[PDB]
């Protein structure tokens, strides 16, 4: 399972422990219609702890400004590329003109896209000039813009994942992280369809997952 | 099939599920064999612990409440236990065997201690039944039950928190009863993550009993 | 601040870091009354919970072990409890009063239930003393003590986790015994953070008893 | 007012503190003599009894470059409130490494030219950003062109146990020089408020190097 996001980003499923029945087993402390009914009962009454026994590992490629928002979710495990020592692809998120639709801009949205590519090209060339002259990466990389792509592994249980979808798969969140949250919701739906449907029905406080088919 | 280890007279540690193995920590450390095992020893030696959070276990444990209270102090984990208010219980209790009192100079034989423990457990359980039969709700009636009453719980924990649990509980300073439970956790962990377990015993394990037993 | 709970229990305030303005400062990332109170209500109303993590409390609680086990399930907090292996204990037990069984149709009078609970507690405690006198270590001998034995612990918790605790424990679905302790926690919280507590009751509180019982 | 300047425009400022060394002593004993209290702090540190130190809490206000704040926010056992890149007003200040930061590195151009080239690209990125804002582009999109050395501000609420884990990892020569400077300031404030815990930490638990080399 791999879903492309933005111009060069992605959300990829690395591993998963369990499925809907893992929450049923934990709720009953015991190793179809009755099991699905139990998932809905747990969700309808705020019994969230059984859902902590379903765990996912994702491999995400996202711009640093999106990764900073994501890393605010503390109840999860992260391993990211080192800005000091890792090899980077040096790819950057260049918003398409349609990203500025709805905004009354003084210049055409095409010019915004061009100006963004222009400054990232200059910052990247300056960075290369510093590396070529012997400056270590940990110092030279500080000139790189916030739209630089990074990669990380994210291990998260279904309860914390559902909190993430409540907050990020919502119109109040930045459009870029909304797109990533839609991909997380899609993989979550594929692996835990009963929990996902129950979540949308009773616990989900956001808006876009009840408007967009994932 | 899955690992199951019996502990004490009626307890057990059972493996329900596991996500990953040693290579899950290697994949997370690289964000992407002698070289893979060498990377595990390197992460362990230099204290790079976060990759080990990408290996997760789910156990089903049956333990006396006094042991479970010690276990539930490990907050970086997920728990689901039988409800003392609403769950049906087996009403089993941990009766220490006479050998548990070896080394202690007791005025009565250790066999009599075992008998006195079974005796008070029987009286508390019969009093409890008398209260339930007369309409007292379980959430009130169960408060007379002794601390050696067996409970059951699911424990979902990553390898990093599990290794912290072994440092603290698989050690002679911890109570003998929880040491037995920690040996079973260490055993299942070794079976699923042999490279991480060996690296842990070699460079990070602070206790004593895992290097003796 | 000390509030008695049950027959021998208590909730006592040991220390507190901050007040309502600590959440205001954190929300604005900056070190008047109506504007500050309006901000507390805005953050509460829209689910901006992280600012409330910058208000912290330390309580000293004396509660029966069955109550303490429910409390220790709240992992986003710090605990230090008396050791069952090595601490000196008071050997006090929670004996429910007859009024605790009101509403239940019992075969025997509620007074007899209270008596039977004191009776088995006394026998378990005497058996425990007989084991200690004969050389059995406390870590083994104490396993015969009932779940209503009182323990003591220090609880350090931030206002966000404390509000989650009130949502779950200051509610009629929770056991009556932990509800009484949650009312005392809500009371001390109200005294120290009156704006946050009022905003909490108005917009984020999911329970029922804090909107029924005067605190 | 404890405030320590870090780098060219950064700082670590103490906002509030709950407790001191005696807060860990009270939690260890579960109870609400100088030599005996200091001896207990050393005993807890020596034998790895860490939970009592969770009852001492600090709140800091930090101004650090985003590349440093990202390293700091990896410490999950803490509370954070940062300026919003989408909606907050910013000072638009950037960390320009001084020539001495490149000492020890054999560079093809003088270290002064590296500093100049960094200021140069920072100025161009900032001017491009202003051109986008002036033309109606929202800040959440326009700001993505700003470099990683842009200063941000955040409130950090952390207990002494997590703070000591942070010092173990960041107040060490293996960590990036920039975050070590911030960790030294955190250690100084910690030492001022909890001198017994800090000394005990340095004697028995600290695994880094620089806090045993720098006073
Ligand atoms: C639209 C939007 C705007 C935002 N704007 C800002 C902003 O301007 N500035 C900013 O700093 N942040 C901002 N955030 C980030 C936000 O404050 C949270 O950090 C983020 O959403 C993670 O939420 P969380 O704490 O619930 O998640 P996690 O950290 O994963 O926590 C999950 C749950 O665990 C519990 N929890 C975890 N740790 C603690 C703790 N230490 N204390 C108490 N309970 C805890 C809580 O119940 C929490 O819901 C914004 C988020 C969104 C969605
Ligand atoms: C021999 C022995 C005797 C003990 N005696 C007592 C006793 O008398 N009284 C008593 O109350 N307890 C006692 N304990 C329990 C002990 O204090 C811990 O509560 C328990 O071992 C869990 O340890 P932990 O905090 O490392 O684990 P977890 O709670 O799982 O935490 C794991 C790790 O996460 C971090 N952590 C998690 N939450 C926080 C937080 N809020 N702040 C900072 N860091 C955090 C720390 O790095 C910690 O090591 C005893 C334990 C042992 C082994
Ligand atoms: C009426 C009632 C009945 C209950 N019955 C039972 C029962 O029968 N059996 C039983 O075992 N328990 C039972 N519980 C306990 C319950 O499951 C919780 O353990 C307890 O209420 C603590 O809530 P919490 O997990 O939100 O609190 P905390 O553990 O303090 O967590 C606070 C917040 O942090 C987050 N969180 C913390 N750790 C994690 C994690 N590892 N993964 C994801 N998110 C995390 C969540 O957002 C959570 O809301 C009962 C509770 C109530 C109120
Ligand atoms: C020199 C150096 C280089 C680094 N390089 C990289 C890098 O290349 N890439 C990268 O991604 N990170 C890197 N890191 C960051 C590192 O992996 C940690 O994220 C960071 O040090 C935070 O430490 P912590 O996890 O112990 O802290 P916290 O998250 O504050 O945790 C405190 C303690 O709580 C416990 N804990 C908290 N949450 C959990 C959990 N979910 N499961 C288990 N235990 C838990 C642990 O005992 C931990 O020590 C680097 C750090 C250093 C110092």
Author numbering:
A (entry chain C): 1 to 31, 38 to 220
B (entry chain D): -1 to 30, 38 to 218
C (entry chain A): 1 to 31, 37 to 220
D (entry chain B): 0 to 31, 37 to 219
Copy the relevant paper text.
Many microbes, including human pathogens, utilize the flavin-dependent thymidylate synthase encoded by the thyX gene to generate dTMP. The mechanism of action relies on the reduced coenzyme FADH−, which acts both as a mediator, facilitating methylene transfer from CH2THF to dUMP, and as a reducing agent. As expected, the enzyme formed a tetramer where four identical active sites forming large cavities were generated at the interface of three different monomers. Here, we report the crystal structures of T. maritima ThyXred alone and in the presence of dUMP as well as the crystal structures of the ThyX Y91F mutant with FAD in the oxidized and reduced form.
As mentioned, the interaction between Y91 and H53 could be a key factor in the closed conformation of the folate site. To investigate this further, we generated the Y91F ThyX mutant and characterized it. The Y91F mutant has a flavin content similar to that of the WT, but with different absorption spectra of the reduced forms, indicating an altered flavin environment in the mutant. In addition, mutation of this Y91 has been shown to induce a 1000-fold decrease in flavin oxidation rate during the methylation reaction compared with the WT.
